Design a protein around this nucleic acid. Sequence first.
RNA 1: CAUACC
RNA 2: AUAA
RNA 3: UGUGGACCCGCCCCUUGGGGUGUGUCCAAAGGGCUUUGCCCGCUUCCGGAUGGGCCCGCGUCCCAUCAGCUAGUUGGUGGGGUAAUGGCCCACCAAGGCGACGACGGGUAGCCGGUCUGAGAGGAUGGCCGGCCACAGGGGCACUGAGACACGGGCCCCACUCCUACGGGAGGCAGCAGUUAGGAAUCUUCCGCAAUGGGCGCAAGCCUGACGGAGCGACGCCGCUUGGAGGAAGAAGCCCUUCGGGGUGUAAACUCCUGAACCCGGGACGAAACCCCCGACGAGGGGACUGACGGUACCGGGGUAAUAGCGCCGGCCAACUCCGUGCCAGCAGCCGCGGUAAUACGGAGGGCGCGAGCGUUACCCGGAUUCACUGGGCGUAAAGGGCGUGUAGGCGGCCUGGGGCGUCCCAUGUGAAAG
Lengths: 208, 83, 104, 124, 138
Amino acid sequence: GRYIGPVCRLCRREGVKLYLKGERCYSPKCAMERRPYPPGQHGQKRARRPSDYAVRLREKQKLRRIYGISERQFRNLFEEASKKKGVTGSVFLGLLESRLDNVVYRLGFAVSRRQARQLVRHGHITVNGRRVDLPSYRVRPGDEIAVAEKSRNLELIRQNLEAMKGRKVGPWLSLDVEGMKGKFLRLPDREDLALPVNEQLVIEFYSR
Amino acid sequence: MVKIRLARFGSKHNPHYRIVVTDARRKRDGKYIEKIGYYDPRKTTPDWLKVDVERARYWLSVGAQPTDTARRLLRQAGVFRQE
Amino acid sequence: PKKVLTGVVVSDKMQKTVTVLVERQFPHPLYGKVIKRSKKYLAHDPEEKYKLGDVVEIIESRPISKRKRFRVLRLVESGRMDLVEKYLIRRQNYQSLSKRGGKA
Amino acid sequence: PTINQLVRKGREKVRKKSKVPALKGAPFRRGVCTVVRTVTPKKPNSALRKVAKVRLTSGYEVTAYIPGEGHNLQEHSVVLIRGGRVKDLPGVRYHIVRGVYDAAGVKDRKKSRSKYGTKKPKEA
Amino acid sequence: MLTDPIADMLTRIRNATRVYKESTDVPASRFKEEILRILAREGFIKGYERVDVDGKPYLRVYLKYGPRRQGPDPRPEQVIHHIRRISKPGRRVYVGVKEIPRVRRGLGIAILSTSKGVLTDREARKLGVGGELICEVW
RNA sequence: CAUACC
RNA sequence: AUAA
RNA sequence: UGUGGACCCGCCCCUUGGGGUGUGUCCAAAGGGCUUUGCCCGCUUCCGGAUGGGCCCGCGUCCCAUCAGCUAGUUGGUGGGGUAAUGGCCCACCAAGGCGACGACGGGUAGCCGGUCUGAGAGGAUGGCCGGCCACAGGGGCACUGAGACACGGGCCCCACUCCUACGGGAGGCAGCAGUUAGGAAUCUUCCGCAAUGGGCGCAAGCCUGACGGAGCGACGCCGCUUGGAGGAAGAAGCCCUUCGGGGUGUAAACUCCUGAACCCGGGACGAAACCCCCGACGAGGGGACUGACGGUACCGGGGUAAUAGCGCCGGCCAACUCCGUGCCAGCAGCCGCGGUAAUACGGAGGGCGCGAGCGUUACCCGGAUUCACUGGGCGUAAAGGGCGUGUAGGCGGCCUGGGGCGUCCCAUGUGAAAG
Ligand SMILES: [Mg+2]
Ligand SMILES: [Mg+2]
Ligand SMILES: [Mg+2]
Ligand SMILES: [Mg+2]
Ligand SMILES: [Mg+2]
Ligand SMILES: [Mg+2]
Ligand SMILES: [Mg+2]
Ligand SMILES: [Mg+2]
Ligand SMILES: [Mg+2]
Ligand SMILES: [Mg+2]
Ligand SMILES: [Mg+2]
Ligand SMILES: [Mg+2]
Ligand SMILES: [Mg+2]
Ligand SMILES: [Mg+2]
Ligand SMILES: [Mg+2]
Ligand SMILES: [Mg+2]
Ligand SMILES: [Mg+2]
Ligand SMILES: [Mg+2]
Ligand SMILES: [Mg+2]
Ligand SMILES: [Mg+2]
Ligand SMILES: [Mg+2]
Ligand SMILES: [Mg+2]
Ligand SMILES: [Mg+2]
Ligand SMILES: [Mg+2]
Ligand SMILES: [Mg+2]
Ligand SMILES: [Mg+2]
Ligand SMILES: [Mg+2]
Ligand SMILES: [Mg+2]
Ligand SMILES: [Mg+2]
Ligand SMILES: [Mg+2]
Ligand SMILES: [Mg+2]
Ligand SMILES: [Mg+2]
Ligand SMILES: [Mg+2]
Ligand SMILES: [Mg+2]
Ligand SMILES: [Mg+2]
Ligand SMILES: [Mg+2]
Ligand SMILES: [Mg+2]
Ligand SMILES: [Mg+2]
Ligand SMILES: [Mg+2]
Ligand SMILES: [Mg+2]
Ligand SMILES: [Mg+2]
Ligand SMILES: [Mg+2]
Ligand SMILES: [Mg+2]
Ligand SMILES: [Mg+2]
Ligand SMILES: [Mg+2]
Ligand SMILES: [Mg+2]
Ligand SMILES: [Mg+2]
Ligand SMILES: [Mg+2]
Ligand SMILES: [Mg+2]
Ligand SMILES: [Mg+2]
Ligand SMILES: [Mg+2]
Ligand SMILES: [Mg+2]
Ligand SMILES: [Zn+2]
């Protein structure tokens, strides 16, 4: 997807299992288990107290590097979520989570988001029966996210959905397998996601 | 002489006209006396021509003169139809 | 509406013309304090009627000269020379304030 | 002051005189070298510092600094100055752009390359 | 001379309370009195009364404090924490009804003088006027 | 300590 | 004499 | 001919030269076309409407007081001329006025606005795209023609400059579209089309539009998109460090499978329905035909390749430390400051942080700067109380009652164009 580099060296910088890879991250790796310290020749010496700033910075990185998104595109969302009405923090989360590239991951078509990004850019994903090849596209509520009719018997997709048979998908998403079809029921609320981010902090970093 | 004509308001390749009354010597997209309807040629939406016959009729009644196009649109939205 | 100001004649030393002085109380933009502020108009006195000390209403009118765009609309109160003297000292002061000479 | 005084006089706004009359406002200005020199710093510094006296298309004679370890400027070299005081030589307010006109880019430099103005070392 | 007699009172009061007097005397005016009417009503004083010192007419204000306190310094909390003239001579301050200030989120008042008479902030807003903003009290 | 002059 |  | 209008005088209403009315005088026209006795397009006079303007007024509109006095058409009057029209707009004669510390006069700078940037706001800065107004068309004057001009691609004259010249004389005017050259840190194609919208003339067919709609160049700006996705060692090689055990780059690579930017093939637009023509009546209404610059583009369908990554930074402020080289040198540096032989600050390397078709730099504006303070500052010793008085203007002003309603407050209503 974007960033396109070593992802698990980011798991190892945030000191958190980030799952930027899905499958193997559940193995005995994700980088974290076995070697859970920072990347670089130095990331194993006694860590100095993070400045007030680093703390709020590293926390944003933790959120942005999850959804795999340019800072230019992250901040654009945050500012919008800011101007918007409601707890500007959770509206932000609502917005990231409303992204098509991510909703495809949530409905387990891809096993990662990097994989879900490409699944869209290569046109295997449809919204409301029309095709959408933009990771950015904002899913609204009531929309149905299908797997493209002529993409259905594809290898990467088959394994990915026989694995989805018998698994639960978020309380704000519908999903029927065999039909390769989801449904965006509602914008998730703050306690619906289990993100390892303070998020309150992310707001503070964008007013430094 | 005051006209009733299409002022250009879309964007590149996406044109939307704004049917207006204006002095015929104004620049095409300049200051007008009054808007009395709009019109998208590409019919991108279920509503793509609107008029307000009364204002259209009013202006005609005082010698507003419609371009051969605005007249078509005017006619089509039933501006003239007397039966 | 033809604008109508009320003022004080501070001059009739002029054929058929008075110099009405009009003041305006108003709150100051930035600082909010109320400041007076006043302006001299030349008014058309066609029948050399009003004399200095008169307090007159002045009316917006088609121009009689340059400077002259008002006609004296009516008389309010008369005789009050305080403001005339008021205005008169005001200019007598100017005698100092210079480089040259004159007791202000 | 009293309000009547602010009324009478008022606050006078602040003028902000430039640190760098490269006229025009302009980002940079071209000129010619009319001498390359070595200059001693002050304060607790010592070294030999490369400067130029430049005469500008601004019609201005200013003394620019010549950054980088290696430089190739001569008593008739045309050059592009660009503002940026050197903290140690008093009266040196502008820098010279390395990589523009007669001024060579620094040689065999690998780090802060675009200041100093050197291309991209090429290989596989 | 006494240039602002309202500030004189407002202050006279502020001064008295900070040394915890039982009462204080201001020389009298209906307008001063019409303010004390509000101070009293809204709970800031105990009330006042037209006394009479040396044959000239004063308004004795009766001040009001907290209970005695704990630790070092037992001097009680003040009731009139804060009280200050807004509009003054050579800077008169007038406000529309849409501009009458919410003092301390209403924990305090703002007496203003309107053509319906002297009034609190809540009073004018819920009565539709504006006027000369006299003073905040909190 | 490293320097600068008579 | 000068820099720490 | 006089519907009617204009002018003088009288009368009525009105109140500025507005609207009647009487006598007198004065003032009209143009023809053309056919489906040829009736239609179409024109012409004349008057009244009204619409639209566009002229002029006048209140208030608002940068800096210097190291610019304090300024003015002779100057200020007003009468009568004239002039104009669509008021007016010293201009003229004769008469009065001696007019303006100024509330900043006249002079100087400096500037097209103004809707807006734009910034700011919690008050404020500050700005007026570039777009829209409105003004001004200008090599420089300075001037009028003619017109409903309208003192007229950018109209006229005259004087000036400066380029060109032709038979030596007398003539010709030019990109601050229209492109384009050249010069100056500069720096700013595009001598492109396509009248298909759409708009304009001018024409009854129409049409014609004319470098207005305009499009394409072109430039990462200049915004937005979107790619350089892949899942697996993959208890962890290759090289380079780095080391307490000589090791530790790092690092799931990164290699490699396994999966999608398939680029690219190829096929279909292929919307924008365009009016003018015109036919029925009806040349109305309303119905039927018919023509027309695409962009463009074989957008978009749809099939085929299909693992397929660009840079730049800045890592002493503190400020996210990110280890070797080598250097030795107050070479250098860095936004500020404080680093370098004098063990440099996390200089130059390289490994590693790391931040953004990423960009990343840095310089320049400029607001911010933080309550650092011109109205919101929101100060002056005993930090900068700041005038050496002291007397007092002009100005600012401010005790208690009671009544009138007025200027300030102040309230209700209704008009205006606050579009764009933003
Ligand atoms: Mg600088
Ligand atoms: Mg550097
Ligand atoms: Mg007649
Ligand atoms: Mg007659
Ligand atoms: Mg009359
Ligand atoms: Mg008459
Ligand atoms: Mg005749
Ligand atoms: Mg005939
Ligand atoms: Mg009109
Ligand atoms: Mg005279
Ligand atoms: Mg006259
Ligand atoms: Mg005259
Ligand atoms: Mg001036
Ligand atoms: Mg200009
Ligand atoms: Mg403004
Ligand atoms: Mg501020
Ligand atoms: Mg421009
Ligand atoms: Mg402009
Ligand atoms: Mg020119
Ligand atoms: Mg031309
Ligand atoms: Mg050049
Ligand atoms: Mg055309
Ligand atoms: Mg046309
Ligand atoms: Mg991989
Ligand atoms: Mg395929
Ligand atoms: Mg394949
Ligand atoms: Mg045609
Ligand atoms: Mg017929
Ligand atoms: Mg028809
Ligand atoms: Mg590859
Ligand atoms: Mg740090
Ligand atoms: Mg060692
Ligand atoms: Mg050396
Ligand atoms: Mg060393
Ligand atoms: Mg050392
Ligand atoms: Mg280093
Ligand atoms: Mg540094
Ligand atoms: Mg800020
Ligand atoms: Mg400020
Ligand atoms: Mg201070
Ligand atoms: Mg001292
Ligand atoms: Mg001092
Ligand atoms: Mg003293
Ligand atoms: Mg003195
Ligand atoms: Mg002194
Ligand atoms: Mg005194
Ligand atoms: Mg006095
Ligand atoms: Mg008074
Ligand atoms: Mg009083
Ligand atoms: Mg009274
Ligand atoms: Mg009133
Ligand atoms: Mg608007
Ligand atoms: Zn992982």
